[PDB]
Amino acid sequence: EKIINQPQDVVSEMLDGLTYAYGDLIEKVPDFEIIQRKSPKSGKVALVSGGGSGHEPAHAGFVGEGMLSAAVCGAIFTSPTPDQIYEAIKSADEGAGVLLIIKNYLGDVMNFEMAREMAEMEEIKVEQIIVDDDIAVENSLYTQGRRGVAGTVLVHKILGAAAHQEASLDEIKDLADKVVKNIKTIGLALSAATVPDNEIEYGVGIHSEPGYRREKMKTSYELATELVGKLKEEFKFEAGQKYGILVNGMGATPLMEQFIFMNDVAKLLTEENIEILFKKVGNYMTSIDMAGLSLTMIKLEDDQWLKNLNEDVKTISW
């Protein structure tokens, strides 16, 4: 099944593999599972994110100039602890403050917010944005509202650019609020992640949370029909509207299948006469070895957002 060593070492061994390979990030003093960018501090707002391990490249792979300052990596499918996050906050600060980018899950939000409080007692200026883009099915388990998924990666990029453009904590906070409201995602799974039949489930969570509907095998086009259909209901498509699109694989789905799926999406959208100005395909927020994918659309209600999506970055995975 897995290429690993001792199951309780996977996070540390991975991060050591990561830093060995890409000296361009660093692991904070070999006592913390935090990956920080080597890019010299220069009074930019610092962006900090993270969550459970098992979603690679999510977070650590988006640490670099133009995106995240640091990523705090928890245990597999488990939020980082507030001390880890607190350490990342105070180590990432450049003098302009820190924005927390938090995926909407009970644990992640609890932890990051506590870390925030800790960091504020040390007089660090910190704001937060909670990403709740998953429109699958409301209050999954104990997630309060919508789960935060692949769309988070776009939030990193868009805010990443703004921070790199010397915007203030306040401005970036205001932008995050507008941006997150215009990002919607829905995914599906052909299989569940394995943590160290002929059926599919719509709306599966990235931690292998249950979805809203189980179905016997459907074709790519049929699956695409379901997902675009849901996103169409959410955004209420009108001709002339501008969107970006991200097709994101869950880990064990070949690129071939993601592009076949992209093709189907394209077909389903031509009817809508909307303008797709940004397209992206690949494994950006996975779920270990889950077979499946998700479809993310961002309504481009501001020319700056596209410019930011296309802004220069130097990360491992972008």
Next chain:
Amino acid sequence: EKIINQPQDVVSEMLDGLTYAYGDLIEKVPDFEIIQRKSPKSGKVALVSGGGSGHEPAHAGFVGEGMLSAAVCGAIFTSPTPDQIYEAIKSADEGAGVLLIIKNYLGDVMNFEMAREMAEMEEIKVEQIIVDDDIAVENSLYTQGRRGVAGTVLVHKILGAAAHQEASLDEIKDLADKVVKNIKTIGLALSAATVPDNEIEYGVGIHSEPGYRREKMKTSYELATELVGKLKEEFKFEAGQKYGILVNGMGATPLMEQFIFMNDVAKLLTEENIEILFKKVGNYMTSIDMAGLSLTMIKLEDDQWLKNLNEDVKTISW
């Protein structure tokens, strides 16, 4: 070293052993590590506490009529998760509301407070009290302020009685605030807990947190001199004052040694001409197999507190 089975099963196997032995408590639907009293609900304020496992009998042993409604047991030395606690809140409520008794540690407080919020969204009335009785040494690791230790057990008993006497959530909240401020504790360790030399450490934490001073072996009387000395500085002893006393063993310290220590404490206190109206010795909040003990004093600034300490209860460990 240990009598256990699979290290990851210790909490569940223990709780199953507990319920088998003492049907008088129950484990909530075999999906939660919550121990609730079988005592029939009757519109009393419900008391809920908990924390990491490894401090037995702490919490589960004090679940019964006259004390706690339920205890939420986490992994070893680890706070329970907010969902577990949330489930205990809504299952313990009798219609009069729920008071959370939380030991002051970063994790416990984070978790219980989140659980509180969850429970309040379901319109459950909940108050909280954070116990910070450990005067050892301030902001240990990330504990914000003083750690919550053995004195918590007294808080259970005193509030336990009040709730049993049909006091309202508000009144009980007000009492907790006054009570916790008058409870102070300091302990020491001859050895650290082992989780599944000739030196002692003063102010060791119940999770094997570091203390304030390490010392080569001292006699019982010398150790007692240190502890009473610290508590004397805290309370500022004056003749005529009334106190209760709890000598609490850490798990691997024989009762013989706890009584020899009690004897030394008595001697050191006779000079103070204070009135000791309540005395108690034994293993009430342990730390696995730690050799050591702690000394807890409660200033009895209200005749009701003593009456409550002596009030009837039906728990496993009191």
